[PDB]
Amino acid sequence: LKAPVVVLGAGLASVSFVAELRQAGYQGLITVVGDEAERPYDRPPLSKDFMAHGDAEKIRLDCKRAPEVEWLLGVTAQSFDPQAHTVALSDGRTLPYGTLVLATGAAPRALPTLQGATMPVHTLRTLEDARRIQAGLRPQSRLLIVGGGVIGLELAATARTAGVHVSLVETQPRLMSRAAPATLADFVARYHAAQGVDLRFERSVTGSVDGVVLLDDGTRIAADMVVVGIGVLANDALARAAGLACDDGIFVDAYGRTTCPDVYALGDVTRQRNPLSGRFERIETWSNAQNQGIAVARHLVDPTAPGYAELPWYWSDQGALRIQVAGLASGDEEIVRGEVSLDAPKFTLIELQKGRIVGATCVNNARDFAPLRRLLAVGAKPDRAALADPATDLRKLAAAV
């Protein structure tokens, strides 16, 4: 590993990586450049508890496993020269590097049809965003959310709890089309509708006039605030300019290597192999950011260590639904454990492909999730009758493997 180490971005992936470098035994220089003028913080609370409690000191990331790191907060890396091995900073300084790590994440995609709008329109990515939205979540106000993914739905739940009227516009015929089983998506729509969310499927926004949103069916929605959660775009501009292979995300191998010698990348900014699908994908989960960061650091310090190998998974807390999703959304088979019901929701889904577990969902059923992720990891082929059977406990079934 070539010193000094410079990391661009100070999000979860960055913090996780630098903490692992130190824990693995690297004692040379580490400098982290973070464009946000904020003590590094975790994003999941921004759509939930922060949106509701407003204390940023409850959401900071623990940097104590990363001693002796200089964090340049409020500074933007403007470019890097991979021949000179330097990074140019917005404050006029230049940093030298032996190893450069791009952990610059992703930015919310903006709505092109609302580009010249005159009502409040916000995205939800940063603490600044969350505070700005927080200030607008007054009881009885009218919130329109654009996008029925995890941002929109987590915010929908938080807003309804605060007594805010919520309408939500989604272009697809379903919610969470990105990385969720249809059975889950259907249930989640039923849940939100029952909580008073006004869902609009297969509708695109065509624009707005004076505090009113226009749709593709030729109709209107008036709103006090719009929050746009329509996905992200990788923050890969420095990589594109420097000649790295990128396409809405920096291509990396399991060691986090880019196409440019001595430059690595990790987290939301990367496109990487999903071992379950065998395809290159942006894996934009909290667990990826942490675990890919850790694996890349571990292998830089110890080249004998394996490359990143974890299978993808996430959670989403949407009001009364604590959702956990691992692996692939579908296979050739779905097994449902429990009844799927709005009365005290509690169930598990298991996706199989030719008898092999390729994915799993738990809704208010955390006890089942860890054993299913272990079965997933080893490509388990359990008895499908037993997988369905309510009498089977999965912790023991996983233990038998």
Ligand X SMILES: NC(=O)c1ccc[n+]([C@@H]2O[C@H](COP(=O)([O-])OP(=O)(O)OC[C@H]3O[C@@H](n4cnc5c(N)ncnc54)[C@H](O)[C@@H]3O)[C@@H](O)[C@H]2O)c1
Ligand Y SMILES: Cc1cc2nc3c(=O)[nH]c(=O)nc-3n(C[C@H](O)[C@H](O)[C@H](O)COP(=O)(O)OP(=O)(O)OC[C@H]3O[C@@H](n4cnc5c(N)ncnc54)[C@H](O)[C@@H]3O)c2cc1C
Query: 231 touches which of its own copies, ligand X, ligand Y, none (CB within 5 to 8 A by kind)?
Result: ligand X
Residue of 126, 172, 195, 330 that binds ligand X (CB under 6 A) = 172
* CA–CA distance, 272 with 263 (Å, rounded to integer): 15
CB 101, min distance to its own copies, A: 14
- 332 binds its own copies, rule: CB under 8 A: no
Q: Which of residues 47-86 bind ligand X (CB under 6 A)?
A: 47
Q: Are 274 and 289 in contact (CB under 8 A)?
A: no
- Three-state SS sequence of 100-119: EEECCCEEECCCHHHCCCCC
Buried b (16+ CB within 10 A) or exposed e, 31-69: bbbbbbeebbbbbbbbbbebbeeeebeebebebeebeeb
Q: Radius of gyration (Cα) for the chain, nearest Å?
A: 22
Query: 170 touches which of ligand X, ligand Y, its own copies, none (CB within 5 to 8 A by kind)?
Result: ligand X
Is 54 marked as a binding-site residue?
no
Is 49 marked as a binding-site residue?
no
- Quote the DSSP letter at residue 60: B
Q: Which of residues 21-40 bind ligand Y (CB under 6 A)?
A: 33-36
- 244 binds its own copies, rule: CB under 8 A: yes
- For residue 277, the SS3 value is coil
Residue of 69, 169, 266, 360 that binds ligand X (CB under 6 A) = 169
Give me the residue whose beta carbon is nearest to ligand X: 149
* CA–CA distance, 216 with 15 (Å, rounded to integer): 43
Q: Between residues 124 and 398, which has the closer beta carbon with respect to ligand Y?
A: 124
Residue of 86, 126, 141, 177 that binds ligand X (CB under 6 A) = 177
First to last CA, the chain: 38
Query: 147 touches which of ligand Y, ligand X, its own copies, none (CB within 5 to 8 A by kind)?
Result: ligand X
Q: What kind and span of H or E run contains 211?
A: none
- 314 binds ligand X, rule: CB under 6 A: yes
Distances from the Cα of 140 to the Cα of 78, 212, 239, angstroms: 43, 17, 45
Q: How many residues bind ligand X (CB under 6 A)?
A: 26
Residue of 5, 7, 17, 47 that binds ligand Y (CB under 6 A) = 47
Q: Which of 265, 250, 255 is nearest to 309 (CA)?
A: 255
Q: Residue 388 carries which side chain, given as an amino acid letter?
A: A
- 299 binds its own copies, rule: CB under 8 A: no
* CA–CA distance, 290 with 83 (Å, rounded to integer): 29
- Quote the DSSP letter at residue 4: S
* CA–CA distance, 338 with 390 (Å, rounded to integer): 7
Is 106 marked as a binding-site residue?
yes
Query: 104 touches which of ligand Y, ligand X, its own copies, none (CB within 5 to 8 A by kind)?
Result: ligand Y
Is 190 marked as a binding-site residue?
no
Query: Binding string to ligand Y for residues 124 to 163, with x set by CB under 6 A, is what?
Result: xx-------------------------x------------
Residue of 70, 81, 128, 253 that binds its own copies (CB under 8 A) = 253
- For residue 185, the SS3 value is helix
* CA–CA distance, 42 with 61 (Å, rounded to integer): 6
Is 337 marked as a binding-site residue?
no
Q: Between residues 49 and 281, which has the closer beta carbon with respect to its own copies?
A: 281
Q: Are 254 and 263 in contact (CB under 8 A)?
A: no
DSSP secondary structure, 230-270, as one string: S-EEE--HHHHHHT--BSSSEE--TT-B-SSTTEEE-GGGE
Q: Which of residues 74-113 bind ligand Y (CB under 6 A)?
A: 76-77, 103-106
CB 155, min distance to ligand Y, A: 8
Q: Which stretches of the chain bind its own copies, using CB under 8 A? A: 243-245, 247, 251-255, 257-261, 272-273, 278-280, 307
Q: Which stretches of the chain bind ligand X, using CB under 6 A? A: 47, 146-152, 154, 169-172, 177-178, 204-205, 229-232, 284-285, 314-316
Annotation: binding site for NADH: 148, 150-151, 170, 178, 231, 284
Q: Which stretches of the chain bind ligand Y, using CB under 6 A? A: 8-14, 33-36, 43-44, 46-47, 76-77, 103-106, 124-125, 151, 235, 238, 267-269, 284-286, 289, 314-316
